[PDB]
């Protein structure tokens, strides 16, 4: 069978996380140490598309929304006290109007943003904790909706273009016929 969503959540936040960490030079394998097998050329499949959309989303979403969670992040001060309580409290606030594809892109970049920042200073020990909270939220606190709408394949085929348009141009005045009369 396909048995999707079998384990594309725990390593979903870590995959995008490293994508933003390597940009700063923090890496991830060195975050909490842990033995390092190797992974030279295992291949396996590496044919995931969600990581692609979530990638551009972190950029596109960070343009039209000059102010998205400017208050949410400010309400997540990192410290030896809160963690999943305040994180879920402000996070649930995002998944309240209605679980949507964009909402899933905002909660994703929002989490990686908390790790890239906590690690940007000198705290690479609470990265698995934050990434874990987002991993569980997607494990069974959102998946049921990801498929009810269509599934990750839709989250990309719907917005994440994949050379499927086969139109190239598309402009032509305004890709429309001014139906508004
Ligand atoms: O528009 C939203 N969701 S959506 O209507 O379902 C949508 C719309 C367009 C795109 N993409 C095309 C335009 S770019 C974009 C991408 C992600 C988020 C926003 C824009 C995507 N998406 O890619 O996931 C998703 C959306 C808008 C605002 C918020 C939001 C909620 C609370 C906040 F504090 C800040 C922002 C959360 C989601």
Q: What's the CATH number where 51 sits?
A: 1.10.437.10
Query: What separation in Å is there between the alpha carbon of 103 and the centre of ligand 1?
Result: 6
Instruction: State phi, psi for 14 to the nearest 5 degrees.
Output: -75, -35
Please enumerate in sequence order all residues whose Cβ is within 8 A of that of 146, keeping only pairs 6 or more positions apart, or say none: 5, 104, 138, 152, 155
CA distance 70 to 109: 13
Distance linking the first and last C-alpha atoms of the chain: 51
Question: DSSP character for 25?
Answer: T
What's the CA dihedral at 116, 117, 119, 120 to 10 degrees? 100
Work out how many domains the chain is built from and give that number: 1
CA distance 91 to 73: 10
Length of the chain: 181
99 contacts 142 by C-beta, under 8 angstroms: yes
User: What are the phi and psi torsion angles at 97 (to 5°)?
Assistant: -55, -30
Contacts of 102 (CB under 8 A, 6+ apart): 57, 61
Instruction: Outline where 48-142 has alpha helix (H).
Output: 50-64, 70-74, 84-94, 101-121, 127-139
CA 70 to CA 73: how far, in whole Å?
6
- Is residue 119 packed enough to be buried (19+ CB in 10 Å), middle (13-18) or exposed (0-12)? buried
Ligand 1 centroid – CA 121 distance (Å): 29
Residue-range definition of the domain harbouring residue 12: 1-181
CA distances (Å), 37 to each of 40, 42, 108, in order? Answer: 9, 12, 27
Is any atom of ligand 1 closer than 6 Å to the C-beta of 100?
yes
How much of the chain is in helix, strand and coil states, percent to nearest 5?
Answer: 55, 0, 45
- Determination technique used: NMR
């Amino acid at each position: 069978m396909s048995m999707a969503m079998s384990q594309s959540n725990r390593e979903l936040v870590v995959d995008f996380l490293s994508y933003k960490l390597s940009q700063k030079g923090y890496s991830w394998s060195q975050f909490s140490d842990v033995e390092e097998n190797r992974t030279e050329a295992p291949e396996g499949t590496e044919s995931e598309a969600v990581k692609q959309a979530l990638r551009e989303a972190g950029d596109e979403f960070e343009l039209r929304y000059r102010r998205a969670f400017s208050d949410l992040t400010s309400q997540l001060h990192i410290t030896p006290g809160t963690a999943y309580q305040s994180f879920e409290q402000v996070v649930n606030e995002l998944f309240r109007d209605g679980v949507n594809w964009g909402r899933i892109v905002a909660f994703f970049s929002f989490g990686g943003a908390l790790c890239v920042e906590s690690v940007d200073k000198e705290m690479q020990v609470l990265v698995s904790r934050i990434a874990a909270w987002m991993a569980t939220y997607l494990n069974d606190h959102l998946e049921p909706w990801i498929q009810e709408n269509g599934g990750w394949d839709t989250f990309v085929e719907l917005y994440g273009n994949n050379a499927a348009a086969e139109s190239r141009k598309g402009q032509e005045r305004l890709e429309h016929h001014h139906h508004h009369h």
